[PDB]
Every structure is written in C-alpha cells, then in structure tokens.
Amino acid sequence: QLPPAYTNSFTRGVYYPDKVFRSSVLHSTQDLFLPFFSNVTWFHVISTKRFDNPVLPFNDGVYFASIEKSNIIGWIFGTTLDSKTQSLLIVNNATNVVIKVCEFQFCNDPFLDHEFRVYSSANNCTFEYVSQPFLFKNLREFVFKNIDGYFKIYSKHTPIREPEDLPQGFSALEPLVDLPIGINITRFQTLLALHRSYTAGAAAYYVGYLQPRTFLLKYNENGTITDAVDCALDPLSETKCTL
Amino acid sequence: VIWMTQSPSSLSASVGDRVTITCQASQDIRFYLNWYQQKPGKAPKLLISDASNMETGVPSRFSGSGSGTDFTFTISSLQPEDIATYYCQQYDNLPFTFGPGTKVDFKRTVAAPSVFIFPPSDEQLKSGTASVVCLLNNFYPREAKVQWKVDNALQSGNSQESVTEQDSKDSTYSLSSTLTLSKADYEKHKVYACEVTHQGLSSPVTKSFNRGE
Amino acid sequence: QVQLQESGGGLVQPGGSLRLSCAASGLIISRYDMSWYRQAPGKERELVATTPIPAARPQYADSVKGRFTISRDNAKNTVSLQMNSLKPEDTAVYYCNLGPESQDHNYNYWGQGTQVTVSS
Amino acid sequence: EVQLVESGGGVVQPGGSLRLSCAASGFTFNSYGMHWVRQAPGKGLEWVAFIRYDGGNKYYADSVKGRFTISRDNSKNTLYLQMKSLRAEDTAVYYCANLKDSRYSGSYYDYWGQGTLVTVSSASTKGPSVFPLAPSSGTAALGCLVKDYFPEPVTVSWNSGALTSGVHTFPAVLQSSGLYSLSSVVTVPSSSL
Ligand SMILES: *[C@@H]1O[C@H](CO)[C@@H](O)[C@H](O)[C@H]1NC(C)=O
Ligand SMILES: *[C@@H]1O[C@H](CO)[C@@H](O)[C@H](O)[C@H]1NC(C)=O
Ligand SMILES: *[C@@H]1O[C@H](CO)[C@@H](O)[C@H](O)[C@H]1NC(C)=O
Ligand SMILES: *[C@@H]1O[C@H](CO)[C@@H](O)[C@H](O)[C@H]1NC(C)=O
Ligand SMILES: *[C@@H]1O[C@H](CO)[C@@H](O)[C@H](O)[C@H]1NC(C)=O
C-alpha cells in the first residue's frame, strides 16, 4: 500500500450549525468542528492490482474535499458493508442522484462503468430518494454528520494559481439535505468510475475528522458568516473568546 | 461483563483430518466475534472477522459459522503449518474479552520412554544444597506421570517438572523432574524411588537409588 | 436589510384558486425553514403552513388540511402558496416569514401583507 | 510498512510505578483508537485499556482499574501506559494493538506491536551457579544444571558450539527463593566417540 501524505487544513471546514436567523451579532457555540491548522490526509490514485480505495473510519463526522479535473468520484456508508446489516448508498448519475438504504452485498472492488457493478444483491429496501445532481477545475467540499437519527450533508463549490496547498480563505458550507434514516455508521468508502480500456486518473481527495470544540462566529446583516475564531487554538484567541 | 469459553482445551489431529473448535458466550453478542491464531514467540494473527467473513490471503481451508451464543471454527485439511493457539474475542460491549485458548498438535504412534535417574554431584554438596533429577527422554504422548517415593511415602511441594515442545523431526517430547534436598537430609534414607507411569509401557517402571552409591 | 414583499390577493368567490408569491431581499431561503402565517379580526395570530429543509415533508395545521400547497424556488428566492377551495370564513391577511424554529428571542419583523376575501 | 515499537520494559519493585511508550509509523495514527494487551508467561491473552482517536473517553478493565492510566500524545504519535501500585501478578509481556472492529472503532485493518516484558520482583541481579550430575555409562546418561540466577535470558553453550545436536533446552522455571533454574540434553549421537 502507498504511503500517506498530510496537508495543512488552514481555515476550512466552517458550516452553519443551526437553522436560526442571526444578523449583526457575535455568537459562541460549542459543537463539532474541524480544528484550525490541523493535518489532513491526502489520497492518490496512481497506476499486482492497485488498491487506491481504502475503507476509513467515520468517527463523529467527516469533512471531505475533492479537486478533481473531471468527474471520477458516490459513497457507501455503513457498519459491516455486507448483507448482515443495512447501508446507505449515494450515487451521482448523469441526470439524477439516487440515495438508497437497503441490505446490500457489495463487491470486493465496487467500481462504476462510464453501472450496477457495485452490488450483487440488494434486499429489504426502506428508503429511496431522487433529486437533481449535486454538481475548468473546481474544489468541491462536503461535510457529513450523523446525529439523532438524521444524516446531514453540507456542501460548497468554489471555482479555483498554486494547487500545492489548500487555499487560505474563508467560506461557509451551506445545508443541502437532511435524510431521516435511522442506521448506525462507523465505516465509509468512496466510489470511482473506471473507463473501460480499448484504468486510473487524477483522483485526489482529502479526509478530515471533527472534534468537540467551541467557536466564535460573526454574522453579517444579511445572515452570512464572515469570520470565525477558534478559542483553544492559541493564547491570543483565548482573550478574544473570554471577552 | 461477558465470559468466554472454548472447547476443547487441547487437541491432536493427523494430516488430512477436519478440525472443529467451539466458542461460547455468556450473553447474546450477535455476530460480533473475531478468531485469532498465535505461534510461540510471535504476535497473534487475525483469521475470521464478524464470525463468517474471512480476510485477504487466508487460505480457503479455514471457515467459521455460528450466531448468538454458540460459534464454530473449522479446518478442512491440516497442513503442517497449522500448529498454533486460537482465541475467540467479542466486541459487542466494552470491556472486551478474550478466550482461554485451544492448542493443536500432530499425532504419532505410541513410543517408549528411556527413564534415567541422576544423583547430586559432590560440588553440589560442597555448597550446602542438593537436587535429584529424573529424566524421561523421547516419549510421544503428552500425559505422563512421575512420582518420587521416600520409603514408600507420598509427598508434594518439593518437586518441579519441565516439559519441552514438539521436536520437528520426530514429533516427540522430553520431561525433567527435580526434587531439592538439603545436605543434612539427602543420604539419611536409602529408599529413593522414581516411579514412571505412562500408557506406552506394559507396566509402570520404578527405579531406585542407593545412598552413597 | 431583510425585506419581504407579498403579492397576490383580493376579492374572490368561494372555492377559488389563488397563487400568493413572496419576494425576499437580504435573505437566502435555502438556509432556513420558512412558513406562511395568517391573522384574522379578533383572532390574534395562528400558524398556517410550514416548509422544512429538503428530505422532509410540509406540515400543515389540523383545520387547513388538503386546501393549500407550498412551493420553494431557491434560484429566485421565491415562496409560493397555491390556494384550493375555501369556506367564506377564511377571509384574512396573510404573512410570509421564517418558521417557528427559525426565529430567535429578539425577532420582531413583519412585512406589509396581503388581503384575501371571499365574497358570499 | 506499518510498524509499532514499544519501549519501557524491565524490573520493578513491589509498590512501584512504571511508564511504557509506544511509537507508530507507516499509517494515520490520529484517526484510530488504540488498545493495550498483556500476556502472562505461559498463560492466555488479556485486555487492559482502550483510548479513542482524540483522547477523551478512556476505558479500563476491572482488574487494572483505579491504578492504571492511558493517554496519547498525538503531536509525536505516541501512546502511554502509566502503572502504579504494582504487584507480582502483573509480570507479563505487553503489546500495542489496533484491532479490527465493526462497532466502536471502525478499523478495517489490524496491527500489533513487538512486545515488552515487565517483571515485578525484589531480587537483585546475580550470576548463574552450576552443579553437575553423575554420568552413567544407547545408554548415554549424564547431567548438567544451571541454578540461582535472576535475569530472564541465558547463554547456551554445551561443548564449544561445534555441533548443533543436543539442542533441546528445557524452559526455566521460577523458584520460591526468587531465582531460576534450567537443564540440558543428556544423550547425544554415540557415533562421534
Ligand atoms: C441515469 O442516467 C442515464 C443517462 O441517460 C439515464 O438514461 C437513466 O435513466 C438514469 N437513471 C435513472 C434511474 O433515471
Ligand atoms: C426482508 O428480508 C427477509 C430476509 O431476506 C425477507 O424474508 C423479507 O421478505 C424481506 N422483507 C421485505 C423485502 O420487505
Ligand atoms: C446502534 O447504536 C445504538 C447505540 O448504542 C445501539 O443501541 C443500537 O443497538 C445500534 N443498532 C443496532 C441495530 O444494534
Ligand atoms: C445584503 O443584500 C442586499 C440585497 O441582496 C445588498 O444590497 C446588500 O449590499 C447586502 N449586504 C452586504 C453585502 O453587506
Ligand atoms: C502536523 O504535522 C506537523 C509535522 O509532523 C506537526 O509539527 C504538527 O504538530 C501537526 N499538527 C498537529 C495539530 O498536531
């Protein structure tokens, strides 16, 4: 297996905690957030078969980032990833998205065709959702949370000179979907589409994990978050948080 | 807390024989079980996860099944490299719990021990202590019994036993029994009997020692 | 600088069909749970309709079931209510703002409003 | 590749304290929970303590509860075990573990360390003492003995090491005095003399 690489998180990962309107205030919130200036892991897909799709822990929430030039990247979430338990499948088809919750039997290499080669059997289906697709080079960022019997997705998409490090700037992730599923999640995996040879590509992504922390957020007159500070980052920010 | 039990404790099988081991739990743990394998002097290795799912690289001969309280582990053909100890672990509820363990050996026909007896040396007597030793060399079956008799008396607490592992060329054991005596009470009694009982001999064999000799 | 303007309303015969539109400036609908409110002479104020975040269904009131439909156009910041048949006792003024779960303690804002009347 | 290395083993008097360190290399250490496992000499496997990915919640077994502490230093990829009020039943070999679990820590891979020996005793270091046994003259009978030495290993040499025959080394057994004892092979192929 290829060695892992790390990159600085910078000021990324801030999302809207709740659904309440706040304008021209400063609010202190204790919630699950990505700590500032943390190290995140970086996954490559480089061409005795290649194993570039590991199975990773979910913990208490996941921050996912992709900088793909073309669309190679859906997801699988679950506990056992077999037929003994239920799993969540998200697939981004060319025209529509499909979200399903069933008992699946997933293959050893769940790849896609540029289609249903992800599972051999799917029984006991208890959820099904179809909607618009989630969609130069662009940076697409997602935050996945699983709390009180609800799966919450937050998304952001920003058009991009140097791609070596994640950009230094502030942007807030906006709510996308709140699925009312009731399953337990401890593992997750990513799906890659392989074009048939007459297969790899520039598929790189970043994964990070959230922690319980207290943040101070600034709201503007229109309800948009403009600045945020981490209380436990440094002694200088402690004075600002204490007030 | 959860108790774990395994059966059997020790097993011996020949080449090409199917082997079955059982693990039992105190309460329901669904299919959250793991099966391990450890060889002497090395860290354990995981074989079966979730009570049915194997792992990449594990040969096709191994298998596992069961659910609830009872779980079963199975080997089809016993290749020579399957001598180890297997443990069953549960992870349904913290704290976790391992099992006692099951040992697996190879079988071979009955053999005959060559029991020897050795007296303490003079250099031992020069330092105010002595130890008498009985040797059982090259007997196959693990279970064998050695008893020290002082004028036809039964005593315990002054005897210690050491047994080695299987020897690859012949698959056979060796056993040593030691009994410690002080310099004031070593030759006071002529009757020192080493009695060996095993299923490899037609009759139990007792060899005596002569004081001074 | 939040500003809400409601349009669509007036005098109609019983059991008509009306489409009320809400234009919001300074606010992004995609982030909040919006609602439709009603107040009547001497009736104080009572909730009418609610439109939660996607992957959830509308929740009406018990006495208004099966008579209104809601829509949410996020691209142009529009909330619309389509009116089915109604009893003549439904004449009132209708407001458009955030839902009960999207309001703080210090929120006192209400737009102009629209009048709807059933002529019997 | 993946490598776990442990350090801190040795000899501790009763009532003492000790600290064991563990270093991880080759994989993302800050995304998993970790376990401490111990094995007694000539006995089974036991589970000691568990820590989550960001510190926080810590779990201990009922035997080592109230006198053991677990912690992690994520900046240097290090795991610690602090041991207090030690007694003679803790003599064992310790490993760091990343265990595969579909519940709690959702690890899809399992890794183990090398191991470190911790011995609790009040006896100082000492050198072996030898007393032979009477050799009787296959019928090749003889005797050798090593006795009264504390530290666990031993240097094996029968006849200058020219031949590898007679290699069955009987394991050492601990005495009530506090020191160890061994023996050695008796009969050798009588075709060399
Ligand atoms: C997936 O996209 C293809 C593209 O043409 C379309 O034909 C198909 O109907 C889509 N799947 C579903 C379930 O609509
Ligand atoms: C759920 O799965 C069981 C076992 O496969 C099956 O017997 C049952 O009919 C299923 N229920 C459904 C599909 O509603
Ligand atoms: C999911 O996790 C909760 C939390 O302990 C547990 O009570 C529940 O049994 C789990 N689900 C299943 C199907 O076991
Ligand atoms: C808020 O939005 C209004 C209209 O959408 C705009 O005129 C105003 O400048 C915005 N406030 C800012 C950008 O601070
Ligand atoms: C990130 O990695 C660097 C280099 O190993 C280290 O100095 C730094 O402390 C790490 N960040 C955190 C938050 O531990």
Residue numbers in the entry:
A (entry chain F): 23 to 69, 76 to 101, 103 to 141, 145 to 146, 156 to 176, 186 to 248, 259 to 303
B (entry chain A): 1 to 213
C (entry chain D): 1 to 120
D (entry chain B): 1 to 52, 52A, 53 to 136, 144 to 199
Any passages from the paper?
The S1 subunit of the S protein is a major target for neutralizing antibodies, which is composed of a receptor-binding domain (RBD) and an N-terminal domain (NTD). Unlike RBD, which is responsible for binding to angiotensin-converting enzyme 2 (ACE2)2,3 receptor, the function of NTD is still not well understood. Here, we present one nanobody, N235, displaying broad neutralization against the SARS-CoV-2 prototype and multiple variants, including the newly emerged Omicron and its sub-variants. The cryogenic electron microscopy (cryo-EM) structure showed that N235, which engages a highly conserved distinct cryptic epitope in the NTD, appears to exert a neutralizing effect by interfering with the neighboring RBD and inducing the S1 subunit shedding from the trimeric S complex.
To make the mAb/NTD big enough for cryo-EM study, an NTD mAb, S2L20 was used to co-mix for N235/S2L20/BA.1-NTD complex, whose structure was determined at 2.8 Å resolution. It revealed that nanobody N235 bound to the NTD with its three CDRs (CDR1-3) and one framework region (FR, FR1). Of which, R31, Y32, A55, L98, S102 and Y107 within the three CDRs of nanobody N235 interacted with Y38, K41, V42, F43, E224, V227, L229 and G283 in the NTD. Specifically, R31 of nanobody N235 formed two hydrogen (H)-bonds with Y38 and E224 of the NTD, while S102 formed one H-bond with NTD-K41. Notably, R31 also established a salt bridge with E224. Specifically, N235 exhibited a 10- to 100-fold reduction in affinity with mutants Y38A, K41A, V42A, and E224A, and there was a > 700-fold reduction in affinity between N235 and the F43A mutant, highlighting the crucial role of F43. In addition, sequence analyses showed that N235 bound to the distinct epitope consisting of amino acid residues highly conserved across SARS-CoV-2 variants, which is consistent with its broad-spectrum binding capacity and neutralization activity. Interestingly, N235 clashed with “up” or “down” RBD belonging to the adjacent protomer. We speculated that N235 might hinder the interaction between the NTD and the adjacent RBD, thereby favoring the dissociation of the trimeric S protein complex or inducing S1 subunit shedding from S proteins to achieve neutralization. However, the distinct epitope recognized by N235 is cryptic in the trimeric S protein, making it challenging to stimulate antibodies targeting this epitope during natural infection or when using trimeric S protein-based vaccines.
